[PDB]
Design a protein around this ligand. Sequence first.
Ligand SMILES: Cc1cc2nc3c(=O)[nH]c(=O)nc-3n(C[C@H](O)[C@H](O)[C@H](O)COP(=O)(O)OP(=O)(O)OC[C@H]3O[C@@H](n4cnc5c(N)ncnc54)[C@H](O)[C@@H]3O)c2cc1C
Ligand SMILES: O=c1[nH]c(=O)c2[nH]c(=O)[nH]c2[nH]1
Ligand code: FES
Ligand code: FES
Ligand SMILES: [Ca+2]
Ligand SMILES: [Ca+2]
Lengths: 49, 98, 1291, 49
Amino acid sequence: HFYLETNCTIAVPKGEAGEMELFVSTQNTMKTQSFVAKMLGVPDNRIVV
Amino acid sequence: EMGQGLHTKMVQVASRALKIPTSKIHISETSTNTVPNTSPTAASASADLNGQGVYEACQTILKRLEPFKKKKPTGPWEAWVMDAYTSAVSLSATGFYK
Amino acid sequence: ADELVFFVNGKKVVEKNADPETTLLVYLRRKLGLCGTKLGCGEGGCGACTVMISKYDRLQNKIVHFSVNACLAPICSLHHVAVTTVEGIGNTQKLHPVQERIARSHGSQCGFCTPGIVMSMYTLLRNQPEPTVEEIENAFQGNLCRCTGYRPILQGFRTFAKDSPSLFNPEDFKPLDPTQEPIFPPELLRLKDTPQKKLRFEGERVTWIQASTMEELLDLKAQHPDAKLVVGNTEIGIEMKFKNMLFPLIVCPAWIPELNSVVHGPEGISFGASCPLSLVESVLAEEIAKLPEQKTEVFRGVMEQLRALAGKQVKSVASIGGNIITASPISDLNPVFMASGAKLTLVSRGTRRTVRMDHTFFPGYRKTLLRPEEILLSIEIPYSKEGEFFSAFKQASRREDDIAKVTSGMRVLFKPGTIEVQELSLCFGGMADRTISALKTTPKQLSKSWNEELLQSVCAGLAEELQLAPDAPGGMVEFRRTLTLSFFFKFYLTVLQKLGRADLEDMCGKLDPTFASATLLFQKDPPANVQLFQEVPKDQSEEDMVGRPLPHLAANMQASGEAVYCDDIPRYENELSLRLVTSTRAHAKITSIDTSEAKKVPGFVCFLTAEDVPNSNATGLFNDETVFAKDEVTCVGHIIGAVVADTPEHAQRAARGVKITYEDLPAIITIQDAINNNSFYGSEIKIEKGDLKKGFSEADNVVSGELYIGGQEHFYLETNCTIAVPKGEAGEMELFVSTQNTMKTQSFVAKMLGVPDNRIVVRVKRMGGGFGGKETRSTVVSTALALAAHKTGRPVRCMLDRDEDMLITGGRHPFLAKYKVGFMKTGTVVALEVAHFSNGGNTEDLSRSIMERALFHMDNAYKIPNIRGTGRICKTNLPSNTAFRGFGGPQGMLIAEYWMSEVAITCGLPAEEVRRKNMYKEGDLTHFNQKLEGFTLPRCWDECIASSQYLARKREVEKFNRENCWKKRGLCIIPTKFGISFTLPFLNQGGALVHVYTDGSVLLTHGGTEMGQGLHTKMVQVASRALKIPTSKIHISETSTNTVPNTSPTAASASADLNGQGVYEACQTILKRLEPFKKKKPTGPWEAWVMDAYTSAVSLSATGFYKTPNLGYSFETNSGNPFHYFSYGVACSEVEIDCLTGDHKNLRTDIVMDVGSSLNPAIDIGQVEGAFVQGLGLFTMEELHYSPEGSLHTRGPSTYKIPAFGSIPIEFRVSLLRDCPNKRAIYASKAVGEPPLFLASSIFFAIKDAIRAARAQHGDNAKQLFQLDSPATPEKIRNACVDQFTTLCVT
Amino acid sequence: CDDIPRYENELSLRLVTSTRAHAKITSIDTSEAKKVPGFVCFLTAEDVP
Ligand SMILES: Cc1cc2nc3c(=O)[nH]c(=O)nc-3n(C[C@H](O)[C@H](O)[C@H](O)COP(=O)(O)OP(=O)(O)OC[C@H]3O[C@@H](n4cnc5c(N)ncnc54)[C@H](O)[C@@H]3O)c2cc1C
Ligand SMILES: O=c1[nH]c(=O)c2[nH]c(=O)[nH]c2[nH]1
Ligand code: FES
Ligand code: FES
Ligand SMILES: [Ca+2]
Ligand SMILES: [Ca+2]
């Protein structure tokens, strides 16, 4: 693809109820959220992309 | 937005649907906590899908502002909005398309 | 020297460049990132910063533990010590029993004070695994909570002591295994061998020398008398932080053994000067229990003053020598040391002398006999001699920093086998700029016998010798004068009893039986509490949590310190700090601003002013306020500008470097000034019904009078804070704020910057308290911070220090009322005319709406045929007053109950009868013509009188009063009616947004903000019932303007009603979309329906909105409903006042509150108790004081006394009315936030009741309608108890 | 994404990838990595919650 900006992610943990906010260079916020949630073992409603 | 001008197109669509200048509409970002279960921005369908969704969200707003414009036909957009607000009318809406 | 080494939660900390000015609190938070420990006052008075310290005691070969205030502990004093913070004892994945119990017991509300309270309790358990109920309460003497009302906290921890449905189940509490506590750092046990070497630390401006030997100390003091001694720092910390005192060279001798010794001599016990007050307390305590009473008269006198002196955190590090040398006019220890002639050993390089404390020891204001190179070595507290008696007293309050607070030590020695005075020493504090002795009075008593003539003689002398000019600094001259005589009187009576115990009965006298209670010393009465609520139908699904006592959703995280509050959020690497610069003149023109000195401070960036606002400098709810003052300032506290610097320290210093020159202008401070100058906000407001002239004409009686009601500082544990993050694109900015009004915050920032609202995002996760103080006044900080962010392009942050917050943000509105009431001999009120005046401050803000609410409740619970009420909002040169839980209602109602009490007295009928007789009735119309439907007040009344056994107890009060001369009891029952809904119609709306993700989890958000009231918990409960899924699948993360727009502020107790409905609707829309899928898979699980909906392309997102119908009152036609419904409640409270000191005890309080069908009884009972205690404070403890020039003096917990653990009624009972659904609101519930607060007036009137009893025994003779303004502080109570001392007749 | 200012306590992450098309992972030695200044930790399959 050679997008000028390569893949990048900033993950900001909130320390509460598994909450986490991620700033990402992605075309798919839904899957990013789901995959992060499943990996951590927390509900989707705790992850915001 | 990945450079294809999607937000530009969505603001254009919203501006026509709402009958107001594009300068009064702003898109800041995309987040899972404002619009959930979204499809990836792909298949060249994003403007198609979201444009339609934006259109519906705007129609809902217009319908709620209906009574106020009918009363103040010439009055500016800001007047209808403030009147809707002080009349306790919701000025927030979701839009969806399949 | 150089490096500082200590441990934090078992982790070694090595600081190579420790700065003497760095406190443990800032180090933990900003350096280590451990933000569980909070800044609540930085004064040592709130305890939000409590942490535990552990160290190997050199002179004990043992490991010890104790708590301290992190805000006052210099890190340079912590070398080779081990610190334990809330994060160190446990977390949500594994809570420590202390964290678990306070959480499950509903003892955590906003949660800002929880970590500190957890550490106080935790430290207690480390020193005493099985504490008594009394030790548990004493553990929190230094911890303040503004939300809970304390009951839940003590009840939850009681389970640690060796001493219908329920709110929580202790049986499920995890057991405590002490062996599992954190190990003492092994290294500190090894480093325990190597000798302690002197250390030297050099900061940006200060140099710290940690002396290891007496030799090094005296040597330094000899070569540099300049060196400032610092031990506990509980005094120097205040001086440096709040008085801008800077000491370039400091020396801490805490390590020196000679200064920490405890020697038992033949004359007494000698304590090294650096001995902490906690050690002095424990040593004297041991002696008092083991030695004969006759030898511990002085020891017990010292224990008396130490008992209420601060808390454990302070007494652990505060040295006895520190108190002495500080030489404060109100020190409670020096008067005792003087009166007892304690010996002080002073040393210097090569010199050593001994002097007994007397009038000469304190030359002038804050000075002593000590030479610049001398240091206090030790002090010997004397054993009392046979025939020697001692007493110690202290004023029940404190208004000024270090003056006008009467404290005393009194001693007397009799000639063996007689009652003839051999020696008499009466020393006082708070009566001059230093501790003094009545040297002119006492000598004239030598040789005299202890009799009635001596009492007169002494009283006559003190009244003359301790004379206070009406001009005297500190005021309260009458009160202070009366206290000196009253205290001596207690001493006089006490000596009589003691002489009697020595068998001199037939010589001195026996003492009137009814006089005995006057000598009684402080006694901790065991607490008793009961909470009654209605169980939900047995039929209710176990997953349906509506009506169940579900603990606050964030309780666990708050007890663990993991819950994040605004300032806990990590700083960006490029983040800047802002400090506000405020006016020091009530009204003046700004002739110039000089920042030359500000620019010299390291890290300075810029000074923002009106010229810097890009668009409009006009802000405020009514656009009559300036972001930054231009040309003139209109109050002390008026924001002139803001300094931006790299750190908060640099911003504070830079701020002091902004020199402003003024030109005073005519100022209007008080309500009289406003009236005398026709200075008001808008026109007169009024409500009138019936015929007044006729009403009074038919009245058998007519009473007129006035009443002044003091204001109130919210004192939310977390002060105002804002973080502004600029995005660098199209004016976009995101702000994290501690506010109850995201909408106005967003609007003000936008207008100030000149960008549309759609560019500004305001996010509020939670507030550590709000109570109305953050409904609008928080924007004052937000706009300034947002401007800095815009100008610098960098994120900026600002959290106000307590003094700044109390000064700048205003508070409740002080009220002045002039009433005239006409009634019949039967007690039936026929006519009422009341004119109200409130002090609004320098901007309108919410003042008008507040006055409107007061007028809406000037009737309280009574039907008055002919009534007229008027109100004017005074425009003055004081910080703008705003909303405060009650919103004008408590003031309007207190006035009503005041003239109502006089009605009862005048008619000679029982107060309860007079009140019940005038009470409204189902279907009646109020003075503003609204119909009272579902009027439950009568039920609350009947239930409360019966349940509290009011009548029988009224008999006990009479009995107590006939058998007690200087102690009186009062018992009053007060009702209340509170209208629910914003007085401004359209503000009664709410919105919500719900999302159901494909995994079935739900993300909910609404316009309400969480400030400790458990709003999110209730909304999750509501949504769970509406959706038919467990609360566990629903989550609320925060409140945001970009998820729900145009939200009303979280206020008027209407947030649950509004947002609950909004949430309910959003959930219904979701259900409708899921219907097709569930009808196809009836038993199928929620997750299956959700995924089917998703793959069928059905929207799983929806907004919800609600508008309270049929509202809209008109003052012009006195028609239309301003409220959706009313809240009702009744409270019966009993008190026991001290007629000689003005102090009192809140004995018992019974409350019956109608909260409809409670959404959560745990949270609602929590709100009733919390609101009630805030009221208790408003009416009896809380008092703000301003200089005649309009400058607020009361700016911290040391001078502003809010309720403490020990302030609540010993026996506290709360009942939620059964079977009273309120169909109108979400799930038949009723708002609960504000209604309960006024019920605290029951204590006010119980006190007025007691005073009346006191006056009937010592005053004139008749039943006058004496004046009792609010707050009914010890001063007002004492002055009202007219007797021979207030009149000086005993003279 | 990467233009966003870093938090003062923000950390950096770098992925460790396979140099073989298909093979068994016999062992992993991080002894040298631990010597690098600033090293915090090495995440592997074992660390996924
Ligand atoms: C929340 C709070 C509530 C309080 N309430 C009360 C109260 O109700 N009644 C009351 O009486 N006090 C009260 N205090 C005051 C307290 O007792 C003193 O601040 C403390 O005891 C002093 O000791 P320190 O070691 O902290 O002294 P520092 O603050 O370190 O020093 C105080 C001063 O004494 C000097 N000094 C210290 N040791 C020596 C020595 N050995 N030789 C010569 N000079 C020395 C120091 O230079 C300095 O000027 C309160 C304090 C707080 C923080
Ligand atoms: O009628 C009210 N309006 C408000 O703005 C407010 N704020 C508050 O705390 N109570 C009330 N009541
Ligand atoms: S912040 Fe330390 S006592 Fe309040
Ligand atoms: S819950 Fe304790 S101060 Fe708020
Ligand atoms: Ca305030
Ligand atoms: Ca005001």
